[PDB]
Amino acid sequence: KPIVFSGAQPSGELTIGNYMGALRQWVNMQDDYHCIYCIVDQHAITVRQDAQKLRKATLDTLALYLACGIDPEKSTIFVQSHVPEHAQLGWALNCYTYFGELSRMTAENINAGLFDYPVLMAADILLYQTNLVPVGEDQKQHLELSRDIAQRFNALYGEIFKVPEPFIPKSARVMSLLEPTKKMSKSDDNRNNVIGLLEDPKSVVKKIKRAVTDSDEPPVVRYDVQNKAGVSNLLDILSAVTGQSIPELEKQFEGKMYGHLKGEVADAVSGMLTELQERYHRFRNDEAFLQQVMKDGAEKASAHASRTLKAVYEAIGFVAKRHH
Amino acid sequence: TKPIVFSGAQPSGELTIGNYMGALRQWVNMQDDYHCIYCIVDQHAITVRQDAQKLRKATLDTLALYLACGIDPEKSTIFVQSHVPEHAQLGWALNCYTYFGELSRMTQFKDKSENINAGLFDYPVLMAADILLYQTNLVPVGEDQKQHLELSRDIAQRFNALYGEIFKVPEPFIPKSGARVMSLLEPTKKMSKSDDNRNNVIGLLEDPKSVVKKIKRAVTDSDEPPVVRYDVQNKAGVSNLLDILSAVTGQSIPELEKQFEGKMYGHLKGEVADAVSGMLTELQERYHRFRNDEAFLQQVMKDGAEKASAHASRTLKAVYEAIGFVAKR
Ligand SMILES: Nc1ncnc2c1ncn2[C@@H]1O[C@H](COP(=O)(O)OC(=O)[C@@H](N)Cc2c[nH]c3ccccc23)[C@@H](O)[C@H]1O
Ligand SMILES: COc1ccc2nc[nH]c2c1
């Protein structure tokens, strides 16, 4: 099976765009690939965090990924800081990364971590002999650096690393509720644009009801991204939840207004979210289960990570560690 | 418990008399008075590109040389940096509490700057992690590491202010003489352990006969008559020789100045060559005994890494608890 590596930020509150797009897709491909999910708490501290919130957010992220359907028996899920090999390889790879490359990544009051984290990101991927990396547009420059580091290192010492590839195929279109041209992003400043995975029925209704549509006369529920971005976004969201086709939904809403569309979308999204929240709260409230998931995952990751690091360390020419 | 001493040296190039006077000499003398931990910093060495076989050999060379200088494994903890994962772990964490401007302003980074890698830029942060891991009180180094040591104090204070008494704020221990030994043919420049011109340097593993010839050819000055007195502006070479003689013998500069009244640079150089040649002969005798005893070197690295890991993990656990990571179970 090809190895897939995904970094999960313990800070990003996931939206329905994250779930119905990328996540639900990957939950269904756990028997096709050897998937690795890394909760990146060492990346998170590049921005200053409240200590207690970061600890909570780490566990919130673990429970939500399990709630979405990540299976710790099939996939490997773990906390980044629990595996020392990431930092160990991170430093080694600093020495085979040009300063110019990090300065070219798109002044003196910035912390060194925020400047230097793309090297740790490269080490995260290269530790596990990774074949595929699903990235957004924003993470593409980081993957190229990881690929350039791997090729540069292999040219000097032989075939130590796999040169990773991006996962090209896309999933599910979910746009922002008040700016349907812009995609629904977890990083969005305005939260009225997004529907979080842990939102209750009343909060979704309020946000869906206020979603921008259009001033067509008569009002007509038809798919058209150019001219009816808002109405089209609501149909896409409804299609993603229920599995019904857009033309099937256009037939369903024939002679119906936007208020009735918005009601069916709110009803459907909350039906999906309520099952996901049952799972979330059940996993999140069981500390013994979360501890056992983290131990097994870190144990799995560390076994594989140490094999690569030992080869990296042997190649560079360090004296081998004495054990007992 | 005793206050803690930590220091380290790179296994790259070949250690000089400069490295001995500014650091190793103080390391040997501190062993009973304080709890001493000394480290071979192979992770710092790879910031400059090494041959793989040369790096492995240089690590074991450096270990043997510590032992030959008088670093006793029964008194001090001696280990290889890469054998303790906690150095890289804390190093990353301290990156997030170090400003970019602090690293870009570094003298040592600018001088070292074809292969300008991120490790060379990020060098002082890992050095801070080396020191702060062991609750270090004193750091015996040469003058050229003063700026690096300032940053690890700043980092320690900055972190402690936010999270409490996690680190000790370390203090430099720079010697009165031999803190900055200068090049023999270029006494305005520091003696390096990777100088292209080898005649600038007195290697610790260099043939004493060859070392005596380098001292004889060391540049002095055009003063008429020749006078042996300390003056780094106008008499850099003579001052460097007086400084070397002071540090080997333990005698002060004014003591030596009186001793050389009415004498010239032939007497000065004869004394320096004699004192240094005798020290390196004895040092190299002990060296080959330790260096060829692989089982002894294997046991020192094992015991040292074990002692280091126990202490380093105590500090890292508290750092990780403070910053808000979920603890490893
Ligand atoms: N010409 C000279 N005259 C007098 N002293 C000198 C001369 N050249 C070097 N030194 C001193 O020798 C020690 C080793 O330096 P390295 O370059 O091996 O290695 C270095 O420059 C350190 N960054 C290694 C290190 C890494 N982590 C640490 C933590 C604590 C202390 C030291 C370290 C140093 O103390 C240095 O000040
Ligand atoms: C890029 O990752 C790393 C890893 C360990 C480190 N220690 C100091 N800087 C570091 C950077």
Short mmCIF file of all heavy atoms in Angstrom, two decimals, chain A residues 231-262, unseen atoms left out:
data_model
loop_
_atom_site.label_atom_id
_atom_site.label_comp_id
_atom_site.label_asym_id
_atom_site.label_seq_id
_atom_site.Cartn_x
_atom_site.Cartn_y
_atom_site.Cartn_z
N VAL A 231 -27.49 30.36 -4.32
CA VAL A 231 -28.46 29.26 -4.51
C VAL A 231 -27.74 27.97 -4.93
O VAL A 231 -28.08 26.88 -4.46
CB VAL A 231 -29.55 29.65 -5.54
CG1 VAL A 231 -30.41 28.46 -5.96
CG2 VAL A 231 -30.45 30.74 -4.96
N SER A 232 -26.77 28.11 -5.82
CA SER A 232 -25.95 26.98 -6.29
C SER A 232 -25.14 26.34 -5.16
O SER A 232 -25.03 25.11 -5.09
CB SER A 232 -25.02 27.42 -7.41
OG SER A 232 -25.77 27.83 -8.54
N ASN A 233 -24.57 27.17 -4.30
CA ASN A 233 -23.83 26.70 -3.12
C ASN A 233 -24.72 25.88 -2.18
O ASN A 233 -24.28 24.85 -1.65
CB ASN A 233 -23.23 27.89 -2.36
CG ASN A 233 -22.35 27.47 -1.19
OD1 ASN A 233 -21.64 26.46 -1.26
ND2 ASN A 233 -22.37 28.25 -0.12
N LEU A 234 -25.95 26.34 -1.97
CA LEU A 234 -26.93 25.63 -1.13
C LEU A 234 -27.30 24.26 -1.71
O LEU A 234 -27.45 23.29 -0.96
CB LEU A 234 -28.18 26.48 -0.92
CG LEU A 234 -27.99 27.75 -0.09
CD1 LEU A 234 -29.15 28.72 -0.30
CD2 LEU A 234 -27.82 27.43 1.39
N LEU A 235 -27.46 24.20 -3.03
CA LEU A 235 -27.72 22.94 -3.74
C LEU A 235 -26.53 21.97 -3.64
O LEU A 235 -26.73 20.78 -3.40
CB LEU A 235 -28.06 23.19 -5.21
CG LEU A 235 -29.45 23.78 -5.47
CD1 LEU A 235 -29.51 24.44 -6.84
CD2 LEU A 235 -30.52 22.70 -5.35
N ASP A 236 -25.32 22.49 -3.84
CA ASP A 236 -24.08 21.70 -3.68
C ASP A 236 -23.96 21.10 -2.27
O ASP A 236 -23.67 19.91 -2.12
CB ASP A 236 -22.83 22.55 -3.96
CG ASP A 236 -22.43 22.56 -5.43
OD1 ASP A 236 -22.54 21.52 -6.11
OD2 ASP A 236 -21.98 23.63 -5.90
N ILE A 237 -24.18 21.95 -1.26
CA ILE A 237 -24.18 21.51 0.14
C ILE A 237 -25.23 20.41 0.35
O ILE A 237 -24.93 19.38 0.94
CB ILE A 237 -24.40 22.70 1.12
CG1 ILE A 237 -23.15 23.59 1.15
CG2 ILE A 237 -24.71 22.21 2.54
CD1 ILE A 237 -23.38 24.98 1.69
N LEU A 238 -26.44 20.63 -0.15
CA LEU A 238 -27.53 19.65 -0.03
C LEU A 238 -27.22 18.35 -0.78
O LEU A 238 -27.54 17.26 -0.29
CB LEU A 238 -28.86 20.22 -0.52
CG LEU A 238 -30.13 19.42 -0.24
CD1 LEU A 238 -30.33 19.11 1.24
CD2 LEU A 238 -31.34 20.17 -0.78
N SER A 239 -26.61 18.47 -1.95
CA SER A 239 -26.18 17.32 -2.74
C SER A 239 -25.13 16.49 -2.00
O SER A 239 -25.22 15.26 -1.94
CB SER A 239 -25.61 17.77 -4.09
OG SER A 239 -25.41 16.68 -4.96
N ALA A 240 -24.14 17.17 -1.43
CA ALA A 240 -23.07 16.54 -0.64
C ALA A 240 -23.58 15.76 0.57
O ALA A 240 -23.10 14.66 0.84
CB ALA A 240 -22.06 17.59 -0.19
N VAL A 241 -24.56 16.32 1.28
CA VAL A 241 -25.13 15.67 2.47
C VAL A 241 -25.96 14.44 2.10
O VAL A 241 -25.66 13.33 2.53
CB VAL A 241 -26.00 16.65 3.30
CG1 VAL A 241 -26.72 15.93 4.44
CG2 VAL A 241 -25.15 17.77 3.88
N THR A 242 -26.99 14.66 1.29
CA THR A 242 -27.99 13.62 0.99
C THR A 242 -27.56 12.61 -0.07
O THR A 242 -28.07 11.48 -0.08
CB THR A 242 -29.33 14.25 0.54
OG1 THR A 242 -29.15 14.96 -0.69
CG2 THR A 242 -29.88 15.20 1.61
N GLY A 243 -26.64 13.00 -0.95
CA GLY A 243 -26.22 12.16 -2.08
C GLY A 243 -27.09 12.25 -3.33
O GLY A 243 -26.79 11.60 -4.33
N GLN A 244 -28.15 13.06 -3.28
CA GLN A 244 -29.03 13.29 -4.43
C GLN A 244 -28.30 14.17 -5.45
O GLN A 244 -27.51 15.04 -5.06
CB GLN A 244 -30.32 13.98 -4.00
CG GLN A 244 -31.22 13.16 -3.10
CD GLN A 244 -32.23 14.00 -2.35
OE1 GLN A 244 -31.90 14.63 -1.34
NE2 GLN A 244 -33.47 14.02 -2.83
N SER A 245 -28.58 13.95 -6.73
CA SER A 245 -27.95 14.75 -7.79
C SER A 245 -28.57 16.15 -7.85
O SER A 245 -29.68 16.37 -7.37
CB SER A 245 -28.07 14.05 -9.15
OG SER A 245 -29.35 14.23 -9.74
N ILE A 246 -27.82 17.08 -8.43
CA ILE A 246 -28.28 18.46 -8.61
C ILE A 246 -29.57 18.52 -9.45
O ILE A 246 -30.55 19.13 -9.02
CB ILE A 246 -27.16 19.38 -9.18
CG1 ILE A 246 -25.99 19.52 -8.19
CG2 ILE A 246 -27.69 20.76 -9.55
CD1 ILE A 246 -26.27 20.30 -6.92
N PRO A 247 -29.59 17.88 -10.65
CA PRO A 247 -30.85 17.86 -11.44
C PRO A 247 -32.04 17.18 -10.75
O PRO A 247 -33.18 17.58 -11.00
CB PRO A 247 -30.46 17.12 -12.73
CG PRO A 247 -29.11 16.54 -12.50
CD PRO A 247 -28.46 17.38 -11.45
N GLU A 248 -31.78 16.18 -9.92
CA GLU A 248 -32.83 15.59 -9.07
C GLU A 248 -33.37 16.62 -8.08
O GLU A 248 -34.59 16.72 -7.89
CB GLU A 248 -32.31 14.35 -8.32
CG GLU A 248 -33.40 13.50 -7.68
CD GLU A 248 -32.85 12.40 -6.80
OE1 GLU A 248 -31.73 11.90 -7.06
OE2 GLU A 248 -33.55 12.01 -5.83
N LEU A 249 -32.47 17.38 -7.45
CA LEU A 249 -32.87 18.43 -6.50
C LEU A 249 -33.59 19.60 -7.19
O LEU A 249 -34.55 20.14 -6.64
CB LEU A 249 -31.66 18.95 -5.70
CG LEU A 249 -31.11 18.00 -4.63
CD1 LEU A 249 -29.79 18.53 -4.08
CD2 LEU A 249 -32.10 17.78 -3.49
N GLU A 250 -33.15 19.97 -8.39
CA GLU A 250 -33.85 20.98 -9.21
C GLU A 250 -35.29 20.57 -9.53
O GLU A 250 -36.18 21.42 -9.55
CB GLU A 250 -33.08 21.25 -10.50
CG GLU A 250 -31.77 22.01 -10.28
CD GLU A 250 -30.94 22.15 -11.55
OE1 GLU A 250 -31.00 21.27 -12.43
OE2 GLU A 250 -30.21 23.16 -11.66
N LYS A 251 -35.51 19.28 -9.78
CA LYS A 251 -36.85 18.72 -9.94
C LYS A 251 -37.66 18.77 -8.64
O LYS A 251 -38.84 19.12 -8.66
CB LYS A 251 -36.78 17.27 -10.45
N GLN A 252 -37.01 18.42 -7.53
CA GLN A 252 -37.63 18.46 -6.19
C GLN A 252 -38.10 19.86 -5.78
O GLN A 252 -39.19 20.01 -5.22
CB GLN A 252 -36.65 17.91 -5.14
CG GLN A 252 -37.21 17.77 -3.73
CD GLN A 252 -36.23 17.10 -2.78
OE1 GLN A 252 -35.75 15.99 -3.05
NE2 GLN A 252 -35.95 17.75 -1.66
N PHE A 253 -37.29 20.88 -6.07
CA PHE A 253 -37.61 22.28 -5.72
C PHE A 253 -38.29 23.09 -6.84
O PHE A 253 -38.27 24.32 -6.81
CB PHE A 253 -36.34 23.00 -5.23
CG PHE A 253 -35.84 22.52 -3.90
CD1 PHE A 253 -34.74 21.68 -3.80
CD2 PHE A 253 -36.49 22.90 -2.73
CE1 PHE A 253 -34.29 21.23 -2.57
CE2 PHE A 253 -36.05 22.45 -1.49
CZ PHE A 253 -34.94 21.62 -1.41
N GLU A 254 -38.90 22.40 -7.81
CA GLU A 254 -39.63 23.08 -8.89
C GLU A 254 -40.88 23.76 -8.32
O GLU A 254 -41.69 23.13 -7.65
CB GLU A 254 -40.03 22.09 -9.99
CG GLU A 254 -40.52 22.75 -11.27
CD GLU A 254 -40.90 21.75 -12.36
OE1 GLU A 254 -40.34 20.64 -12.39
OE2 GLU A 254 -41.75 22.10 -13.21
N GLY A 255 -41.00 25.06 -8.58
CA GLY A 255 -42.09 25.87 -8.04
C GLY A 255 -41.99 26.17 -6.55
O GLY A 255 -43.00 26.48 -5.91
N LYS A 256 -40.77 26.09 -6.00
CA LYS A 256 -40.49 26.37 -4.58
C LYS A 256 -39.54 27.56 -4.48
O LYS A 256 -38.77 27.83 -5.40
CB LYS A 256 -39.87 25.16 -3.89
CG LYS A 256 -40.64 23.86 -4.03
CD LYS A 256 -41.89 23.82 -3.16
CE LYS A 256 -42.73 22.60 -3.48
NZ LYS A 256 -43.75 22.32 -2.43
N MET A 257 -39.59 28.25 -3.34
CA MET A 257 -38.83 29.48 -3.11
C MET A 257 -37.55 29.19 -2.31
O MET A 257 -37.33 28.05 -1.88
CB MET A 257 -39.70 30.50 -2.37
CG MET A 257 -41.05 30.81 -3.04
SD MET A 257 -40.94 31.83 -4.52
CE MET A 257 -40.90 30.61 -5.83
N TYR A 258 -36.73 30.22 -2.11
CA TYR A 258 -35.43 30.07 -1.43
C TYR A 258 -35.54 29.76 0.07
O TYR A 258 -34.64 29.14 0.64
CB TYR A 258 -34.54 31.31 -1.63
CG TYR A 258 -34.23 31.68 -3.07
CD1 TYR A 258 -33.78 32.96 -3.39
CD2 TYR A 258 -34.37 30.75 -4.12
CE1 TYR A 258 -33.49 33.32 -4.70
CE2 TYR A 258 -34.08 31.11 -5.43
CZ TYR A 258 -33.64 32.38 -5.72
OH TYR A 258 -33.36 32.71 -7.02
N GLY A 259 -36.62 30.22 0.70
CA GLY A 259 -36.89 29.91 2.11
C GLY A 259 -37.06 28.42 2.38
O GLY A 259 -36.57 27.91 3.39
N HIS A 260 -37.74 27.73 1.47
CA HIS A 260 -37.94 26.28 1.56
C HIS A 260 -36.66 25.49 1.25
O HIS A 260 -36.44 24.42 1.82
CB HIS A 260 -39.08 25.82 0.66
CG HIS A 260 -39.56 24.43 0.96
ND1 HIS A 260 -40.36 24.14 2.04
CD2 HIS A 260 -39.32 23.25 0.33
CE1 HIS A 260 -40.61 22.84 2.06
NE2 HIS A 260 -39.99 22.28 1.03
N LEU A 261 -35.83 26.00 0.33
CA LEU A 261 -34.50 25.42 0.08
C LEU A 261 -33.65 25.50 1.34
O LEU A 261 -33.13 24.48 1.80
CB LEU A 261 -33.79 26.14 -1.09
CG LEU A 261 -32.31 25.81 -1.35
CD1 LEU A 261 -32.09 24.32 -1.56
CD2 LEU A 261 -31.80 26.60 -2.55
N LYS A 262 -33.53 26.71 1.88
CA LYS A 262 -32.76 26.97 3.11
C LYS A 262 -33.19 26.10 4.30
O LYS A 262 -32.35 25.68 5.09
CB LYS A 262 -32.85 28.45 3.48
CG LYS A 262 -32.00 29.33 2.58
CD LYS A 262 -32.30 30.81 2.79
CE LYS A 262 -31.19 31.68 2.24
NZ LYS A 262 -31.43 33.13 2.50
#
